[PDB]
């Protein structure tokens, strides 16, 4: 059983002794600080609220377990058994905390309050920052959802330019990161952040997370097709690559099938095996069930172009109305090696320069999609902005002389839409002046209860691109 | 509850239909492929074996649940319901798999077999690579332990040069990455991996993982001390930073305390608050309870040097037997901002050039220690190298023309010690010739049971640096 008393940074165990005496309120906020990634997708807090923060999270056993761990860990008795016992006895172990948050899926410029945390009982002034470590873990779904959405923007731009529409956009970046992330839990969280923007995933774990914590009208959030790996090709032996290819497309004659082709020689495989020996099993394929050739090695841009040139010479190519080349509908390419947001852009630009439509290709990304991201990327931070001490509110902030950017916001905060349709975060309680319309932060958690939830379908709508909107 | 059927990459669901007919054995191995990280700590498999792979992992309802997900996920029926049913019925839901592995904590050069996986029932030829995805996640504890150990090597060399010894080394890189990792589960795994090399962590979840999955003679594998954060200083208001400092040091007068001092002006706080207004509360402190000053901003090297120059002018500095400057025993510094393996090296080097012992300093690291790592850094990779079909064994490998680095090993493999004491992985069954002694892999898993295991104390001994061994000897 997860114990919330053991789910914080160790040193926070000692902070109840460090706040100013006679402090009744500690109020903190989360932003993606300003310093590329101009706007961020707010996603993932609802998972954390439901899995770890709601309901009876304190028991007498958990207090005792925590007290024993801490005594050994610090080699001293510093744990606040009294404050935690108070939460148990007065609230049946429910956290006296109020959290307000922008709705999930909202796309917010950098440097704006995204959510705020405060204690609702003066005895629990120390609790606000106790849960900061858990609350701060929302950067991974925010950063995955944002980085994924930025790649969709690149794909959208180039698909529109080379085909005149956005058909198939949501299947152009497939999540293959299950094995490349650091844990089973990360895999489910990360895959669900990607599906805010796309429909294709092989990280099954993300499907259950969405069903359990968000929900969708459709049976499942993400979809997949049969595909080969090097073990299912190479197990036939080096001389029988062709037998493996033929066996696989015949087993999956009625659905799309992706077949890794670079086990020994990707160029030989496209020109001689797919393009001559097995060509007859490809041209006969249905439009709904194309062969997806997959190259897994070499320079990503160079390999994709040479594969397309090979296939254009063995299969009938047409020219679409924007004047770009298009493979027959039974044949596509997927590039799943070395793809991150930087190389994705180099590739589609490379394709366009060579007059190949982005219709012809999809991308797989694993580590690039889910593991190669850090809290530094959007400068996700949680800081205290307001305290009440001896009954007086004071505005609280950090302003390091060495770095201008690390400066934090002051006082009570609110998020508002400007007259021109942009966003603004009001400091120092100035949102109460009501010069800026309604605060977009809503109470999503109060005193152990989740008070407002969003479905995965609304989140997807909130996160849409303008290009899709237009 | 966790379901093994739903714990693989989607396309692996369809692979039982892609192997050559009449395949009875699939055999696969894991390596950190060759391509600054010459050797890797093998750490982490025992967690996965116990948490996810052992015991009764298949049920009637887990099969049903999986059948229903995959029908909607693929919009077709491709799930191998009868294969999974066979494991349920014949083995009471235990995996007919054998896994052999190098002992945990072993420090192994790149390009060597670290573990192998094969099915022990011909009917379950498809099972070996079904569990590839779960087993490949061992890259992460391996990579954390390896990268953590490479920073220890830097700290050890500099500390030894500066002080003539390694006293305190295991507290010099402290884990602060709980909030900076992608999840609660990652936090515990990565912090346990760091604790293979050091004693200091603030990510409590690492302690319970070690105790449950590995075990230690001691009550806990990791330790911590009281420390302030920006919220506990700034909450007093800007004009009262001195009151905050005095309250915190007084509250933890008899134990070591870390106090972040850059809320407003690191240099003013060291020189005028610590160095003057509150100096009397610092120089009275016990050797066992020093004040640790923590700067959290600006250039990491420049800030540490100027902080130290300031403290050397307000406090009595000594010179140690190697000629390096040493703060009084009640005063230390910790640098927790911008520390990764690259900047860690620039700091101790710049300290050494300015004649400051590494005794004076420790480092904290968070995202740098536990989040900024990928499977690409050590090329951790799982591949089939041997199959049997129609009773004939076959050596299998992948050899992409474009990339020589992606070439994989062939046939049955074994790990051996060379005549010079080095490691070599023998291919194509050649270990069976017995020209290199016995295979160093052990069966750690077979048919649903964990068959060999290591305590965290054994793993720590295996992962020691050469310099530490030399010091002991
Ligand atoms: C076969 C394609 O399937 C769907 O998208 C997928 C693609 C894809 C491939 C190449 C293209 O040029 C492209 O436009 C899309 O690739 C996948 C690969 C997988 O391993 C799993 C998948 O679900 C898809 C996946 O869902 C889309 O319906 C697409 O319109 C159709 O061409
Ligand atoms: C007060 C120090 O505690 C221990 O090391 C730690 C240090 C440290 C600091 C400065 C130095 O120059 C140094 O050599 C070490 O810092 C910590 C900071 C934390 O937030 C938590 C900790 O557990 C330590 C932590 O455990 C060691 O036992 C060291 O001997 C002692 O000086
Ligand atoms: N069926 C598939 N379709 C597209 N890309 C795939 C794929 N399977 C794997 N990949 C890409 O390759 C990565 C997995 O790497 P592998 O373990 O297959 C190759 P290696 O690094 O071990 O030599 C994934 O993150 C994904 O980007
Ligand atoms: N008590 C402490 N001692 C040393 N370093 C610490 C520390 N607390 C935090 N850090 C460093 O600062 C990182 C966390 O930064 P914070 O979240 O406190 C400020 P910011 O990330 O919003 O700019 C940790 O990964 C760690 O490297």
From Swiss-Prot, chain B:
Keywords in alphabetical order, please.
Acetylation, Biological rhythms, Cytokine, Cytoplasm, Glycosyltransferase, Nucleus, Phosphoprotein, Pyridine nucleotide biosynthesis, Secreted, Transferase
Q: Name one GO biological process term.
A: positive regulation of transcription by RNA polymerase II
Pathway membership, UniProt: Cofactor biosynthesis; NAD(+) biosynthesis; nicotinamide D-ribonucleotide from 5-phospho-alpha-D-ribose 1-diphosphate and nicotinamide: step 1/1
Q: Where is it chiefly localized? A: nucleus
- Cellular compartments annotated: Nucleus; Cytoplasm; Secreted
Listed result of changing residue 230 to A: Reduces activity towards nicotinamide
Q: Which parts of the sequence carry Phosphoserine?
A: 455
Family matches, as InterPro entries:
Aldolase_TIM (IPR013785), DUF5598 (IPR041529), N/Namide_PRibTrfase (IPR041525), Nicotinamide_PRibTrfase (IPR016471), Nicotinate_pribotase-like_C (IPR036068)
Q: Where on this chain does beta-nicotinamide D-ribonucleotide bind?
A: 202, 294-296, 336-337, 367, 375
Give the recorded effect for residue 159 to S.
Answer: In a colorectal cancer sample; somatic mutation
Q: Which residues carry this modification: Phosphotyrosine?
A: 171
Catalytic activity from the UniProt record: beta-nicotinamide D-ribonucleotide + diphosphate = 5-phospho-alpha-D-ribose 1-diphosphate + nicotinamide + H(+)
State the protein's purpose.
Answer: Catalyzes the condensation of nicotinamide with 5-phosphoribosyl-1-pyrophosphate to yield nicotinamide mononucleotide, an intermediate in the biosynthesis of NAD. It is the rate limiting component in the mammalian NAD biosynthesis pathway. The secreted form behaves both as a cytokine with immunomodulating properties and an adipokine with anti-diabetic properties, it has no enzymatic activity, partly because of lack of activation by ATP, which has a low level in extracellular space and plasma. Plays a role in the modulation of circadian clock function.
Which NCBIfam families does the protein's record reference? PRK09198.1
Instruction: State the name under which the record lists this protein.
Output: Nicotinamide phosphoribosyltransferase
